[PDB]
């Protein structure tokens, strides 16, 4: 051990007491049931670094006696160094800042509160509900597993942050009502500021605090579709999408290492876009402007002003991490500020500015990889280059290679060399199977659709995210906020594509029986953004299972924003990226919450819009598709040699279209069927709206593609 | 400054709005096919001299439109829902009326134009254009002595007119006196800027409505003799404290 990692793990378990004590195996507070929980389990296998750690969930006079009773010499530490680990680590609990029966309210919707469960994609969907009291029991069974995975863990920061998510994720870290922070979150965050002091050079202060000794590190990239759409193949697109993650990873990863901090200080890196918590010491900045500018010209060397990388950092103070009548908030705005003029001034770190085959293979070893390593970049086996490494696929069968290991969608290390860093990445990578192993294409998902053979394209965004987390206090509720967040894309979207969450999702607009095997794949999904193609038909309902889905993950309190898209599957990739693109950022400028069903005709009159509000779409499609729609491609047969009265509708509804105000589109209207759309509807006129037949043609489009 | 706006009213539709370099390179080459080699280098000497037009902007009827300096974009703050969603689309915005530039340019409130007198069509077979609206096209700003506007611009003007005709009328922009200036063209900068947008061509060129403190920009001949235009079009901007 070193004072560093002490450091670390330090805060990382100072309130490990509260599921201790919410189990009731002892007989004291957190601070004091959690001292005797790892001295316990120190002398079970038998590490007595357990029992150094045990020292801060707890005048000074005793303490020093306790500290020199657990020889410091024996870990190669001082006596004097673990005092200040200590009152560090106290400061640091503070700045990331009662029943024993509450559970996690939502940070979406503090009104309601999830159900103890463990982090697991595979099993359930987090939906906040009605708030149940957890028993005593589910925090024993809680602190077995908890107790089982410490006995084999390797006492390394990455070793334990995985096991700390798994079990304490869905865990109050205080039990008071409308509790909106996870345990895991406000225990990392602790151990990202316990180390920035640390590497701050301050020491026995009651002066960090009230001084500028940590940094706010925001990393973000511009120009991400301009990198990853705009090809001249899908297994290429996946690829591109794959290695803007690695390079991004390669900047964070170096950061952490040239500044000696732990994956801990990463409050978030999703969307291409990373926060760090550091010291402010000059090493560190020296530090930052050497990586800052030699990851820029790796960029511009590689791929010339497509994809730039704004890097900027402000000195912040431990005032500055807490509220004082909002600071926090106050910090990242100053801080955004300095992204948007670095944006302004792309590759202004070059003063020379005024004057790929490896991704085919990537793309073709994608199905049967389970992560990367991170090596030097002349190293054996390497198959892409970031900024700062080399990147050695990592295989079914194969030994893993380098100082860190990057693995995919799990929180086990698995078989991984014992001195080899755990980096746990998840991305949302559902993908259809062909005959052949390899990922589908444009053409076969298009042939497997509905009726008429396009291929579907959807970009989805969630509707003002970052208003939302500059709500956020604390760097503990930003982390639960931006890991919840990043979660449901990265995490949940596979399994809404699967066919799960059935009862949560319930009845959605709708062509065919969803699949086992869906014609869909995943080109992007992360941090609140989304691009997916696949049959137009299975694309149209999953953009209804997705916004309902999230509808219930967030508590009815966050909205999405979706535009779909119905291309010729020859259509070429940056073609559909900006129609889709068109139609999305239109669904967000007819105000938010709505959906970009179908391209349309309208009066240009500014009372007409294009978009639907979601639960418009959804009463339409309830009210009409049952009465002219059978399912599975074909119609209800009343409509058999009747498929002419829909069209007869577009045509009514398109001298809707011509003129408005002109009353010929009462006159024209078995006439049964649509009785709302024969009246000239009033309330509508009064209300400065629509008529109701502008409004059907969503409905029949969908319908008429679906039975050709 | 007073200026002669060159108005392209339109005779079918466009494959680009053209910018400065593009421009240039068709004066350039009309002069050629006119006068010979010897009027092309007394057009670059007027020029390198301190001549200068703009890139090609939308007009539609008695309304010019002008590039959105990217001297408000950091300066947008200057509701909480109100806030970040105009805030934004101010952001998205490549033009503003010729009024509220003058206000842009001084830091002060300003609006954007709600419909753009142009649409990029591009029909499927693929390629593109550029339908015009009615009485609506591109125009151009030529600053520098009159001698050299009616001995080489308006002759090249005329020549390239034979898809369009071409009228032009004096134009004025108020604008802040100032140790910074809004380029009307994309430029080669001599010193590095203040804020900007890269243009790939291979040249790096800096976008219109990029913000630079007494740069003049620069021409290149090169040998495939043809001269390359990357001169600023500088108007004084007042500047946001960051
Ligand atoms: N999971 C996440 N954690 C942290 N930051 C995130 C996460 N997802 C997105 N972000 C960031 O939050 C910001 C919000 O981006 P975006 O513009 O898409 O949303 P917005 O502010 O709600 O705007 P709009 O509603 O107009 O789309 C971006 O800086 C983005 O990178
Ligand atoms: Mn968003
Ligand atoms: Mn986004």
Same mark, same amino acid.
């Given at each position: 051990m070193e004072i560093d990692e002490l450091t670390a793990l330090g805060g990382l378990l100072h309130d490990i007491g509260k599921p201790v004590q919410r189990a009731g195996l002892y007989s004291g507070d957190h601070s004091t049931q959690g001292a005797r929980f790892l001295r316990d389990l120190a002398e079970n296998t038998g590490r007595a670094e357990y029992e150094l750690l045990s020292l801060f969930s707890e005048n000074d006079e005793l303490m020093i006696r306790r500290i020199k009773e657990l020889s410091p010499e024996r870990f190669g530490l001082t006596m004097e160094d673990v005092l200040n680990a200590l009152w560090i680590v106290y400061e640091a609990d503070n700045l990331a800042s009662p029943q024993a029966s509450r559970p996690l309210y939502s940070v979406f919707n503090p009104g309601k509160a999830y159900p103890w469960? $463990?982090?697991?994609?595979?099993?359930?969907?987090?939906?906040?509900?009605?708030?149940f009291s957890i028993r005593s029991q589910d925090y024993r069974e809680l602190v077995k597993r908890l107790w089982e995975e410490l006995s084999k863990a390797k006492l390394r920061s990455d070793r334990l942050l995985p096991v700390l998510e798994k079990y304490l994720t869905f865990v109050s870290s205080v039990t008071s009502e409308g509790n909106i922070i996870s345990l895991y979150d406000h225990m990392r965050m602790t151990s990202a500021?316990?180390?920035?002091?640390?590497?701050? /050079?301050?020491?026995? $202060?009651?002066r960090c605090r009230k001084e500028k000794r940590f940094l706010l590190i925001e990393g973000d990239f511009s120009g991400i579709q301009d990198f990853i759409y705009r090809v001249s193949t899908l297994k290429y697109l996946r690829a591109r999408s794959a290695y803007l993650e690695?390079? #991004? !990873?390669?900047?964070?990863?170096?950061?952490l290492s040239r500044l000696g901090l732990t994956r801990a200080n990463v409050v978030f890196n999703a969307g291409?876009?990373?926060?760090?918590?550091a010291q402010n010491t000059p090493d560190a900045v020296k530090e930052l402007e050497e990586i800052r500018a030699k990851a820029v010209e790796w960029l511009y060397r590689e791929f010339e002003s497509d994809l730039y990388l704004a890097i900027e950092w402000e000195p912040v103070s431990g005032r500055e991490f807490g509220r004082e009548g909002n600071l926090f908030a106050e910090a990242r705005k100053r801080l955004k500020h300095k992204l948007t003029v670095r944006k302004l001034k792309r590759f202004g770190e070059i003063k020379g500015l005024f004057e790929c085959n490896r991704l085919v293979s990537l793309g073709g070893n994608l199905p049967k990889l389970l992560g990367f390593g991170r090596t030097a970049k002349n190293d054996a086996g390497v198959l892409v280059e970031g900024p700062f490494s080399g990147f050695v696929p990592y295989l079914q069968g /194969?030994?893993?290679?380098? $100082?860190?290991?990057l693995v995919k969608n799990t929180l086990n290390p698995g078989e991984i060399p014992e001195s080899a860093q755990f980096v746990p990445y998840f991305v949302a990578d559902y993908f259809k199977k062909d005959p052949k192993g390899g990922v589908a294409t444009f053409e076969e998902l298009s042939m497997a659709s509905t009726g008429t053979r396009r291929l579907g394209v959807m970009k989805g965004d969630v509707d003002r995210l970052g208003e939302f987390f500059s709500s956020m206090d604390s760097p503990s509720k930003l982390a639960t906020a931006s890991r919840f967040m990043d979660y449901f894309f990265k995490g949940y979207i596979g399994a809404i594509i699967e066919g799960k969450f059935g009862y949560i999702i319930g009845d959605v607009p709708s062509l065919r029986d969803w699949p086992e095997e869906p014609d869909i794949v995943v080109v992007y999904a992360g941090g609140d953004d989304f691009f997916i193609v696949g049959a137009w038909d299975q694309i149209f309902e999953l953009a209804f299972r997705v916004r309902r889905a999230f509808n219930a993950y967030t508590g009815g309190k966050l909205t999405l924003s979706v535009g779909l898209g119905y291309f010729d599957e020859r259509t070429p990739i940056y073609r559909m990226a900006d129609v889709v693109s068109e139609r999305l950022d239109t669904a967000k400028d007819e105000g938010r919450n709505r959906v970009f069903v179908? #391209?349309?005709?309208?009066?240009?009159? /500014?009372?007409?819009?294009l978009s639907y509000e979601w639960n418009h779409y959804e009463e339409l499609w309830r009210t009409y598709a049952p009465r002219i729609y059978a399912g599975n491609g074909r119609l209800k047969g009343k409509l058999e040699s009747k498929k002419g009265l829909l069209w007869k509708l577009l045509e009514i509804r398109e001298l809707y279209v011509r003129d408005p105000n002109?009353?010929? !589109?009462?006159?024209?209207?078995?006439?049964?069927?649509f009785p709302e759309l024969v009246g000239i509807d009033t309330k509508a006129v009064e209300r400065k709206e629509p008529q109701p037949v502008y409004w059907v043609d969503g409905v029949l489009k969908i319908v008429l593609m679906a039975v050709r | 400054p007073k200026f002669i706006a060159v108005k392209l009213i339109p005779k079918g539709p466009f494959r680009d709005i053209p910018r400065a370099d593009t421009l240039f390179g068709a004066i350039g080459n009309a002069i050629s096919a006119i006068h010979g080699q010897s009027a092309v280098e007394e057009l670059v000497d007027a020029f390198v001299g301190g001549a200068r037009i703009s890139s090609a902007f939308p007009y539609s009827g008695d309304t010019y439109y002008l590039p959105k300096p990217l001297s408000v974009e950091p300066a947008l703050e200057g509701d909480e829902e109100e806030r970040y969603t105009t805030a934004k689309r101010l952001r998205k915005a490549k033009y503003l009326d010729l009024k509220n530039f003058e206000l842009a340019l001084r830091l002060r409130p300003f609006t954007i134009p709600e419909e753009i007198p142009y649409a990029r069509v591009d029909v499927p077979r693929f390629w593109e254009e550029i339908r015009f609206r009615e009485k609506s096209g591109v125009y151009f700003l030529y600053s520098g002595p009159r001698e050299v506007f009616d001995?080489?611009?308006?002759?090249?003007?005329?020549? &390239?007119?034979? &898809?369009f005709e071409v009228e032009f009328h004096e134009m004025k922009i108020d604008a802040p006196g100032s140790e910074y200036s809004v380029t009307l063209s994309n430029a080669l900068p001599t010193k590095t800027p203040v804020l900007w947008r890269l243009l790939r061509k291979r040249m790096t060129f800096i976008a219109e409505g990029s913000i630079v403190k007494n740069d003049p920009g620069g021409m290149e001949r090169l040998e495939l003799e043809v001269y390359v235009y990357g001169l600023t079009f500088p108007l004084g901007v007042e500047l946001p404290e960051g």
């Amino acid at each position: 051990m070193e004072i560093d990692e002490l450091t670390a793990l330090g805060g990382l378990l100072h309130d490990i007491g509260k599921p201790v004590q919410r189990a009731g195996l002892y007989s004291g507070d957190h601070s004091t049931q959690g001292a005797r929980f790892l001295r316990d389990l120190a002398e079970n296998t038998g590490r007595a670094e357990y029992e150094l750690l045990s020292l801060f969930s707890e005048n000074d006079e005793l303490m020093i006696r306790r500290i020199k009773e657990l020889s410091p010499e024996r870990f190669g530490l001082t006596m004097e160094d673990v005092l200040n680990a200590l009152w560090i680590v106290y400061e640091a609990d503070n700045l990331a800042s009662p029943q024993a029966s509450r559970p996690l309210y939502s940070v979406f919707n503090p009104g309601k509160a999830y159900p103890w469960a $463990e982090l697991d994609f595979e099993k359930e969907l987090p939906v906040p509900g009605d708030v149940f009291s957890i028993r005593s029991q589910d925090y024993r069974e809680l602190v077995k597993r908890l107790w089982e995975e410490l006995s084999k863990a390797k006492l390394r920061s990455d070793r334990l942050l995985p096991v700390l998510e798994k079990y304490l994720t869905f865990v109050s870290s205080v039990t008071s009502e409308g509790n909106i922070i996870s345990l895991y979150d406000h225990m990392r965050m602790t151990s990202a500021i316990a180390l920035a002091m640390l590497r701050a /050079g301050c020491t026995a $202060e009651d002066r960090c605090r009230k001084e500028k000794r940590f940094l706010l590190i925001e990393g973000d990239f511009s120009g991400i579709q301009d990198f990853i759409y705009r090809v001249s193949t899908l297994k290429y697109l996946r690829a591109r999408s794959a290695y803007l993650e690695l390079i #991004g !990873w390669d900047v964070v990863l170096e950061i952490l290492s040239r500044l000696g901090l732990t994956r801990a200080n990463v409050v978030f890196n999703a969307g291409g876009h990373f926060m760090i918590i550091a010291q402010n010491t000059p090493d560190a900045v020296k530090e930052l402007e050497e990586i800052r500018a030699k990851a820029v010209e790796w960029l511009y060397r590689e791929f010339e002003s497509d994809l730039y990388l704004a890097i900027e950092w402000e000195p912040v103070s431990g005032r500055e991490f807490g509220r004082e009548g909002n600071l926090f908030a106050e910090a990242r705005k100053r801080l955004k500020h300095k992204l948007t003029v670095r944006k302004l001034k792309r590759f202004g770190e070059i003063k020379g500015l005024f004057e790929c085959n490896r991704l085919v293979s990537l793309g073709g070893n994608l199905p049967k990889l389970l992560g990367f390593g991170r090596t030097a970049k002349n190293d054996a086996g390497v198959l892409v280059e970031g900024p700062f490494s080399g990147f050695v696929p990592y295989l079914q069968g /194969g030994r893993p290679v380098g $100082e860190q290991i990057l693995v995919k969608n799990t929180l086990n290390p698995g078989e991984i060399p014992e001195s080899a860093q755990f980096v746990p990445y998840f991305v949302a990578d559902y993908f259809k199977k062909d005959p052949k192993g390899g990922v589908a294409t444009f053409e076969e998902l298009s042939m497997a659709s509905t009726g008429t053979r396009r291929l579907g394209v959807m970009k989805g965004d969630v509707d003002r995210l970052g208003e939302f987390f500059s709500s956020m206090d604390s760097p503990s509720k930003l982390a639960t906020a931006s890991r919840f967040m990043d979660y449901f894309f990265k995490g949940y979207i596979g399994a809404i594509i699967e066919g799960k969450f059935g009862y949560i999702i319930g009845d959605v607009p709708s062509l065919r029986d969803w699949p086992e095997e869906p014609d869909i794949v995943v080109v992007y999904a992360g941090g609140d953004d989304f691009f997916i193609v696949g049959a137009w038909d299975q694309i149209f309902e999953l953009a209804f299972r997705v916004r309902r889905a999230f509808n219930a993950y967030t508590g009815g309190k966050l909205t999405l924003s979706v535009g779909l898209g119905y291309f010729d599957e020859r259509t070429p990739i940056y073609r559909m990226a900006d129609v889709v693109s068109e139609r999305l950022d239109t669904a967000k400028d007819e105000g938010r919450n709505r959906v970009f069903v179908v #391209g349309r005709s309208r009066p240009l009159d /500014g009372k007409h819009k294009l978009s639907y509000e979601w639960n418009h779409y959804e009463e339409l499609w309830r009210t009409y598709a049952p009465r002219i729609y059978a399912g599975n491609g074909r119609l209800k047969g009343k409509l058999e040699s009747k498929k002419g009265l829909l069209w007869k509708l577009l045509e009514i509804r398109e001298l809707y279209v011509r003129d408005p105000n002109d009353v010929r !589109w009462a006159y024209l209207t078995l006439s049964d069927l649509f009785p709302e759309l024969v009246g000239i509807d009033t309330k509508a006129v009064e209300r400065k709206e629509p008529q109701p037949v502008y409004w059907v043609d969503g409905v029949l489009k969908i319908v008429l593609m679906a039975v050709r | 400054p007073k200026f002669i706006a060159v108005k392209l009213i339109p005779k079918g539709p466009f494959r680009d709005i053209p910018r400065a370099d593009t421009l240039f390179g068709a004066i350039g080459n009309a002069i050629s096919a006119i006068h010979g080699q010897s009027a092309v280098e007394e057009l670059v000497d007027a020029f390198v001299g301190g001549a200068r037009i703009s890139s090609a902007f939308p007009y539609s009827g008695d309304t010019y439109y002008l590039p959105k300096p990217l001297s408000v974009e950091p300066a947008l703050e200057g509701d909480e829902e109100e806030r970040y969603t105009t805030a934004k689309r101010l952001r998205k915005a490549k033009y503003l009326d010729l009024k509220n530039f003058e206000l842009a340019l001084r830091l002060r409130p300003f609006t954007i134009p709600e419909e753009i007198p142009y649409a990029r069509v591009d029909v499927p077979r693929f390629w593109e254009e550029i339908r015009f609206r009615e009485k609506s096209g591109v125009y151009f700003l030529y600053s520098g002595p009159r001698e050299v506007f009616d001995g080489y611009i308006a002759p090249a003007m005329r020549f &390239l007119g034979d &898809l369009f005709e071409v009228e032009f009328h004096e134009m004025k922009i108020d604008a802040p006196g100032s140790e910074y200036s809004v380029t009307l063209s994309n430029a080669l900068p001599t010193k590095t800027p203040v804020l900007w947008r890269l243009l790939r061509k291979r040249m790096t060129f800096i976008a219109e409505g990029s913000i630079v403190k007494n740069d003049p920009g620069g021409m290149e001949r090169l040998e495939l003799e043809v001269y390359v235009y990357g001169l600023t079009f500088p108007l004084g901007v007042e500047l946001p404290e960051g």
